[PDB]
Amino acid sequence: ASRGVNKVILVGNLGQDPEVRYMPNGGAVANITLATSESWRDKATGEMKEQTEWHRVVLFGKLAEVASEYLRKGSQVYIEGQLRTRKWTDQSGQDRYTTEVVVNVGGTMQMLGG
């Protein structure tokens, strides 16, 4: 063929309110940041030893809007976007961010969250 399967699945809480914004063509684009966590106590020296990944998801169109009107910090959502590392040059050098992009092929859904 010439395609493959690039899929990301997430169940997490927004760590910050939806970071909305618009662009050319007049685009709706939410930038929520999810946080998954995985703990595993045993053999160390003190207290606690948890780890929590922070995903940089990226919504578009409706979802973007939806996110904006109803998503809040603490909420718990299920994302089915896809990996998309994007290059951008900072105030000098080139930086790239891998973000969770939910475009059609996937979709957000929230739970009872908090």
Added chain:
Amino acid sequence: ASRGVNKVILVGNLGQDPEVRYMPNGGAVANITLATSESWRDKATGEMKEQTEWHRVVLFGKLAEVASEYLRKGSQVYIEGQLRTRKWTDQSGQDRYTTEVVVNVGGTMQMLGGRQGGGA
């Protein structure tokens, strides 16, 4: 005591042979780079186009090894790892890479895929 679900699923072809290591000379860590692709005929030229994401997957333990013994450039694998963006300071500033880490909760599997008969 937080958890949630951080899962990545990939079906793709390695774009470069597998980068394998062993620490402590057995904590094997493979670093294969997958490539997924998504085309479409560009409408304004009518020509063919194709953007292709390159994922940086990371295998461990057995899979790492497995990858090493049987995973070659162009091979097609199914990974079920999880997202793990990790921070590292370059030769000056701080950089972070989001890699596909396959640790237990997931696992690699290859298809007959493309480009075989290695050792002509």
Added chain:
Amino acid sequence: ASRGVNKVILVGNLGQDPEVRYMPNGGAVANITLATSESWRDKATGEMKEQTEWHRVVLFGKLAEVASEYLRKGSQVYIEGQLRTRKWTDQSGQDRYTTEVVVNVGGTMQMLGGRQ
């Protein structure tokens, strides 16, 4: 292709309290039934129509227990088991049930309150 990938992912609510069982082996086996839902509109025969699949998940070992101690009707869990249609002859004919089996390769996790 020689082994393939059989994976099921679910986010749903138990429709009834668990159903723990202990087999000779000594293991515990929870049989919670999840319910996913998908509503939608039309123009043929219906209003805002909603159909809801009922998955028959199957837990083992710890999870089975966990489920038992803290899973009740209405809880919301994330299962990562695998499809497993199993044949069994009823009080006469042969019947087969496709159940969501979570064995190692996957795992349960609940939303809103947990092992806490």
Added chain:
Amino acid sequence: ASRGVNKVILVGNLGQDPEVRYMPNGGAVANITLATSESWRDKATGEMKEQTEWHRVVLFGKLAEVASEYLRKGSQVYIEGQLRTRKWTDQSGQDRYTTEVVVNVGGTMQMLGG
């Protein structure tokens, strides 16, 4: 309280030709049967036993067609449908089949390369 996430992911080989049908008036419906496998040696016998699940996937629209035109037996596909147990009364009693339904939210893709 009217959703959740019901998703099935499969990478497998059709165990035989895709049963391709074109509904009463138009849209088709493919009925390919996937086969996943899981082996292991016997902790005593040493035999290389292997259990293999057979999924009953269901394609629609394009995919259905695609399947028909290019999915040959033995083909290896990736399905991203969702679980859908459906009730039907046999030539007497009530029977229910849990099938892998690929409707929009998912999609078929075959492997090959050679």
